[PDB]
Design a protein around this ligand. Structure first.
Ligand code: HEM
Ligand SMILES: CC(=O)[C@H]1CC[C@H]2[C@@H]3CC=C4C[C@@H](O)CC[C@]4(C)[C@H]3CC[C@]12C
Length: 464
């Protein structure tokens, strides 16, 4: 009477719970760092901030690779661009170019605060027409951030009603949906197991997206001139002519613009939706934010970047949203470029390594009541300045593969929330339904579409 032969073993049920939460629960049994193997591939899950900072910072270069995935190969055209590119010359080149591009908006007649505030005023006007109604603000916000990125990349933007915006929204939604079912970290490779159309569907969306990028590129090749470097595509093209020109082919440049448009639009739109959601569940915090803005900016002017020194609760709220609901609760998978180690455990070349950011932001030894939305935790006991209550906090990642849009992201988020609170009461709809805060884990941690009643504030109207 013997034990059964065991051909496979998994520690939890696939497709049951959010994987990032499942991995975190396993830490109780197994500690902050453990592995799983799928056939020949081995993946390592890291869940403590110290070990995470070893992988991301102290040994960044050792762990800066990206694993190959069938779906990411499609979206990135066989590993071009920045985000899904393996570490290497192509990756390093476009990455630095993209970062240098942000210097052309440091100030001057192309100031980032002004570009953003231009789109936000259009967004505000649009939303004012819905005065007294309940709406889903996904699309207006998406259009506003799409313009901002479009100005950074091409110095161009869309007029309201350009149906191209609906086209983009449509393939974005389709890409995000098919890129993964679960998180980007899929436990079992079901895609390569059962008959399915996922790759063909993803191809189809990626086709439409690429053909649109091709179109914009051929138009820009004729508008481009060496004496005017004002946007990202200039930088890529200026760099191509000075040139190792195999790293700056057409596909490379498109894939790069693709990632920039991708991350620029989807992440920022998502965090605004989450922020509005959390405020609808917390009228009291929302009350104090109105009081804060009314008493620090008033209705004599619009909010500006420099008001982030004054509106501290607004900055704390944004930080607390990125804690509870990180856009990428498992970053993007890393990969060991060389043989190495984490916490003095050996990690081989080619081993996939996921940072469970969700664990870092809910670690009970590092955060007081992690389950709770408490913007206060980012304010000194008085409320006079911001502080870092924990080092176990990495919403934008760190080291070599860290976010390159973080400042753009922080500022866009700050200004949208600041303007919106200045002009609008944002209440629960007359149906009384609150948004679900459970979320949907894709490559981005989406929130369910919900509605808000939007009303021009009486205090703003009086300002005439
Ligand atoms: C609230 C908004 C955002 C958040 C929370 C965020 C967070 C992150 C995270 C976690 C990563 C991956 C770090 C890693 O893989 O270790 C990342 C990577 C990246 N992000 Fe952001 N991001 C945001 C907005 C943006 C924006 C606005 C842009 C572009 C302007 C952008 C461009 C990128 C790119 C290109 C990468 C890949 C970097 C590489 O592999 O070298 N992100 N971001
Ligand atoms: C937050 C983050 O890490 C960013 C880095 C690159 C970003 C991706 C880059 C490209 C795309 C394709 C686009 O159509 C939709 C979003 C999507 C899939 C982005 C989602 C979020 C990603 C993964």
């Amino acid at each position: 009477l013997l034990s059964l032969p065991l051909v496979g073993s998994l520690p939890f049920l696939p497709r049951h719970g959010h994987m990032h939460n499942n991995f975190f629960k396993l830490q109780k049994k197994y500690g902050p760092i453990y592995s799983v193997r799928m056939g020949t591939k081995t993946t390592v899950i890291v869940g403590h901030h110290q070990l995470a900072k070893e992988v991301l910072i102290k040994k960044g270069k050792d762990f800066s690779g990206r694993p190959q995935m069938a779906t990411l190969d499609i979206l990135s055209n066989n590993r071009k661009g920045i985000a899904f590119a393996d570490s290497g010359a192509h990756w390093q080149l476009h990455r630095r170019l993209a970062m240098a591009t942000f210097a052309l908006f440091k100030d001057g007649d192309q100031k980032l605060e002004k570009i953003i505030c231009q789109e936000i005023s259009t967004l505000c006007d649009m939303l004012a027409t819905h005065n007294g109604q309940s709406i889903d603000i996904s699309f207006p916000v998406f259009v506003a951030v799409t313009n901002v990125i479009s100005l950074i990349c091409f110095n161009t933007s869309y007029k309201n009603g350009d149906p191209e915006l609906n086209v983009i929204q449509n393939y974005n939604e389709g890409i995000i949906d098919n890129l993964s079912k679960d998180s980007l970290v899929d436990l079992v490779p079901w895609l390569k197991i059962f008959p399915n159309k996922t790759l063909e569907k993803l191809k189809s969306h990626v086709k439409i997206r690429n053909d649109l990028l091709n179109k914009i590129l051929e138009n820009y090749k004729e508008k481009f001139r060496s004496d005017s470097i004002t946007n990202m595509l200039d930088t890529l093209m200026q760099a191509k002519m000075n040139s190792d020109s195999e790293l700056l082919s057409d596909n490379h440049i498109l894939t790069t613009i693709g990632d920039i448009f991708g991350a620029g639009v989807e992440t920022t739109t998502s965090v605004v939706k989450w922020t509005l959601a959390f405020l609808l569940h917390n009228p009291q915090v929302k009350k104090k934010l109105y009081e804060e803005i009314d008493q620090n900016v008033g209705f004599s002017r619009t909010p500006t970047i420099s008001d982030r020194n004054r509106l501290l609760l607004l900055e704390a709220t944004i930080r607390e949203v990125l804690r509870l609901r990180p856009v990428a609760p498992m970053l993007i998978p890393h990969k060991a470029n060389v043989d190495s180690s984490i916490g003095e455990f050996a990690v081989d070349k080619g081993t996939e390594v996921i940072i469970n950011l969700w664990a870092l932001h809910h670690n009970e030894k590092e955060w007081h009541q992690p389950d709770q939305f408490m913007p206060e935790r980012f304010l000194n006991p008085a409320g006079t300045q911001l502080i870092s209550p924990s080092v176990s906090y990495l919403p934008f990642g760190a080291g070599p593969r860290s976010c390159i849009g973080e400042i753009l992201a922080r500022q866009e988020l700050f200004l949208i929330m600041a303007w919106l609170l200045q002009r609008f009461d944002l209440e629960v709809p007359d149906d009384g339904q609150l948004p679900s805060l459970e979320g949907i884990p894709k490559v981005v941690f989406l929130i369910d579409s919900f509605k808000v009643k939007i009303k021009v504030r009486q205090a703003w109207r009086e300002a005439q």
